Amino acid sequence: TSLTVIGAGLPRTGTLSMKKALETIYCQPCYHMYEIILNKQYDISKWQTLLDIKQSKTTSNEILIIQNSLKEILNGYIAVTDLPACGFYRELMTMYPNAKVILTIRDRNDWLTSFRKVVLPRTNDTYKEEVDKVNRILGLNTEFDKMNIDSLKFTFQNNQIDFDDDNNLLECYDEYNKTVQEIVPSERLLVHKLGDGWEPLCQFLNVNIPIGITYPHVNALKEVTELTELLIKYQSLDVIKTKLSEVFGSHHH
Numbered sequence: 003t004s005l006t007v008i009g010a011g012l013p014r015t016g017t018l019s020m021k022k023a024l025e026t027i028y029c030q031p032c033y034h035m036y037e038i039i040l041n042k043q044y045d046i047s048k049w050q051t052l053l054d055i056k057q058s059k060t061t062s063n064e065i066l067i068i069q070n071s072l073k074e075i076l077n078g079y080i081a082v083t084d085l086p087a088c089g090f091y092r093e094l095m096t097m098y099p100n101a102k103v104i105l106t107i108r109d110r111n112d113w114l115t116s117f118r119k120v121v122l123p124r125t126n127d128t129y130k131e132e133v134d135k136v137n138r139i140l141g142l143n144t145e146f147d148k149m150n151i152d153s154l155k156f157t158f159q160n161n162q163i164d165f166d167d168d169n170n171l172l173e174c175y176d177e178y179n180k181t182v183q184e185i186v187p188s189e190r191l192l193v194h195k196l197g198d199g200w201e202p203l204c205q206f207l208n209v210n211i212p213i214g215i216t217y218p219h220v221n222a223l224k225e226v227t228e229l230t231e232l233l234i235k236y237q238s239l240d241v242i243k244t245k246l247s248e249v250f251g252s253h254h255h
């Protein structure tokens with residue numbers, strides 16, 4: 003039960019819905035950034051040393067350790083979508099010859115606005131302290147941000163670029179999606195546009211369309227922000243105690 007699908011789509015291109023559509027088909031786990039956050043936070047440093055290696059170019063000896071860490075991380079998983087893995091799709095291809103590649107795309111301008119509200123907001127965007135704060139509540143360190151911005155640099159194949167540049171991102175986003183359709187043979191690749199549904203995915207994977215189930219539409223703007231402000235408003239039990247001792251505790255002043 004090794005890798006069968008490689009999700010090269012970038013964040014906010016429908017990577018969680020694709021994840022869920024693959025687990026419905028194969029009934030096996032699919033890797034995702036939310037796996038790291040909610041279950042395997044110990045994989046952050048692994049992905050980091052893997053990204054440190056790719057900062058410089060790799061000796062043949064170097065790449066075998068890359069392939070040996072990717073097998074460790076992705077063992078037991080049938081597929082992989084989202085960052086930081088979508089950037090390693092070339093290494094995953096040579097490594098799993100019987101694995102196909104799916105590329106989720108959407109309108110480049112719709113992606114940017116979404117990409118700015120959820121993933122990486124402009125460092126002046128007031129919504130910065132919000133995304134960063136729920137990270138702290140979930141136990142995400144400075145090294146998480148490190149591993150996240152670095153994986154972006156790797157996926158776009160650019161040592162650094164001013165990420166506060168909307169047009170720069172578009173040029174990187176358009177490039178990446180273009181270079182994926184060039185490096186990967188058409189017979190091994192599928193380009194899944196938002197809303198394509200089961201038919202293409204299932205024909206390209208040679209499986210039955212799941213019966214009675216509807217193609218996922220998860221991780222929408224509405225639900226990501228609602229869950230965000232829900233965690234910001236969350237109250238630790240230790241916090242509830244302090245607020246109770248001011249109502250009911252003996253009052254000193």
Ligand SMILES: Nc1ncnc2c1ncn2[C@@H]1O[C@H](COP(=O)(O)O)[C@@H](OP(=O)(O)O)[C@H]1O
Binds near residue numbers: 217
């Ligand atoms: N089956 C589906 N059909 C239509 N839109 C979908 C969809 N699945 C995801 N989307 C949209 O893709 C984005 C989520 O991508 P990801 O899972 O990689 O984070 C969201 O964009 P919005 O910002 O417009 O809500 C979501 O609404």
